[PDB]
Design a protein around this ligand. Structure first.
Ligand SMILES: CC(C)Oc1ccccc1C(N)=O
Length: 271
């Protein structure tokens, strides 16, 4: 099933859970680098989201989803993603070189295959964002964080969860539908095209999704928003990716395409 690791082996291999530049700062825990094979150890800090992560990972094994190796209770242990998150790579955090348009196209396709796998197997992610799209040694896109995921119809919740800058209008109201995951993917595609984060408190507009309306009101074009840190982008493929993002970002959930359509469209873009 999964490996059951001792707490003290994990404590050891992560230098007694050291937090010096530690890899990531997750929602309900800290991600540490370990050696057992190089691994990622998510030590949870202030319960239900632990069991949900194990349950989802046991059923969901795919090329575009992070692999859970095991757990601990005396901690969640995953395969090491050497190239970190898409967010970090888009911002060139710690001096990493900008991702080329070619790489970005492969990442978008990979992410859409991971989401397709989830929805195929009736799971709603509920927090699709570039920080939750990890990158391996070949820069393969792997969807992460399944602690808030839901085994799916259309339902409502009292505890509204996600990241506001990526959330769909109905998600922000408490609806649980895979249609919300599509909206959030559309925001990620805008981040890939522009190199801009979904929210920037010191930017006009603060929310990236507001650029779709600027483009639509014939004010500006997507060409003016293309990430300048690329030399291999072409109008045809950028416009094609933008067209997919635009469809994903329809305010009315029922007008959005399903993940299968998104997957088809992203493939046609490199055909
Ligand atoms: C799935 C999460 C917990 O894994 C990570 C999170 C953040 C940064 C790297 C990794 C990794 N796997 O290397």
């Amino acid at each position: 099933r999964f490996h059951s690791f001792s707490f003290y082996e994990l404590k050891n291999v992560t230098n007694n859970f050291d937090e010096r530049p530690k890899m990531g700062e997750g929602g309900f825990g800290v991600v540490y680098k370990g050696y057992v094979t190089t691994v990622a150890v998510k030590k949870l800090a202030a319960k239900q989201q632990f069991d949900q992560e194990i349950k989802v990972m046991a059923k969901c094994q795919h090329e575009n989803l992070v692999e859970l190796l095991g757990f601990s209770s005396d901690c969640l242990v995953y395969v090491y993603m050497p190239n970190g998150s898409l967010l970090d790579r888009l911002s060139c955090l710690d001096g990493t070189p900008p991702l080329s348009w070619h790489m970005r196209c492969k990442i978008a396709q990979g992410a859409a295959n991971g989401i397709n796998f989830l929805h195929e197997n009736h799971h709603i992610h509920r927090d699709i964002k570039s920080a939750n799209i990890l990158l391996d040694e070949a820069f393969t896109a792997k969807i992460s964080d399944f602690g808030l995921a839901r085994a799916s119809q259309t339902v409502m919740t009292s505890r509204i969860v996600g990241t506001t800058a990526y959330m769909a209008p109905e998600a922000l109201r408490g609806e649980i539908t895979p249609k919300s995951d599509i909206y959030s993917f559309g925001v990620v595609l805008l981040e890939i095209i522009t190199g801009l984060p979904a929210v920037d408190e010191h930017r006009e507009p603060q929310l990236l999704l507001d650029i779709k309306e600027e483009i639509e009101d014939e004010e500006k074009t997507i060409e003016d928003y293309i990430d300048k840190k690329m030399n291999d982008a072409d109008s045809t493929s950028v416009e094609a990716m933008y067209s997919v993002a635009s469809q994903c970002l329809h305010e009315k959930k029922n007008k959005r395409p399903d993940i299968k359509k998104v997957q088809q469209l992203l493939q046609e873009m490199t055909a």
